């Protein structure tokens, strides 16, 4: 539906808000994989996603529901869970993050 996709819009444009900056930047844009100790990123994460790319694909419609646009910001937690350790600060993030998106995400 039309109207679910402007209600991820609205989900996006809350990640992207001041109220969650202390823990969502490190999603706004693509993993920088020329960091240092980023070299093995691109050989561990087959399918990069950050927040930018999910508003740019959003905004060219690249979702056909909010099924495939949840499936991109899960896509993103999950390539963070998967590379980092456990214990690493960023991790800590993407699960504050995550809490602002499945509450609301679910409740749509
Ligand atoms: C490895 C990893 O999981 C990362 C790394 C960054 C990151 C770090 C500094 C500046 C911008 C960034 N995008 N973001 C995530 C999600």
Same mark, same amino acid.
């Given at each position: 539906?039309?109207?679910? !996709?402007?209600?991820?819009?609205?989900? !996006?444009?809350?990640?992207?808000?001041?109220?969650?900056?202390? *823990?969502?930047?490190?999603? /706004?844009?693509?993993?920088?994989?020329?960091? %240092?100790? !980023?070299?093995? *990123?691109?050989?561990?994460?087959?399918?990069?996603?950050?927040?930018?790319?999910?508003?740019?694909? %959003? =905004?060219? &419609?690249? /979702?056909?529901?909010?099924?495939?646009?949840? $499936?991109?910001? &899960? %896509?993103?937690?999950?390539?963070? *869970?998967? /590379?980092?350790?456990?214990?690493? =600060?960023?991790?800590?993030? $993407? &699960?504050? !993050?995550?809490?602002?998106?499945?509450?609301?995400?679910?409740?749509?």
């Amino acid at each position: 539906h039309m109207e679910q !996709l402007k209600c991820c819009s609205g989900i !996006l444009k809350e990640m992207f808000a001041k109220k969650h900056a202390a *823990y969502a930047w490190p999603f /706004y844009k693509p993993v920088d994989v020329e960091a %240092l100790g !980023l070299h093995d *990123y691109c050989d561990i994460i087959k399918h990069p996603m950050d927040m930018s790319t999910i508003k740019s694909k %959003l =905004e060219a &419609r690249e /979702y056909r529901d909010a099924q495939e646009f949840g $499936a991109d910001v &899960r %896509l993103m937690f999950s390539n963070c *869970y998967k /590379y980092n350790p456990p214990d690493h =600060e960023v991790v800590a993030m $993407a &699960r504050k !993050l995550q809490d602002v998106f499945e509450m609301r995400f679910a409740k749509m």
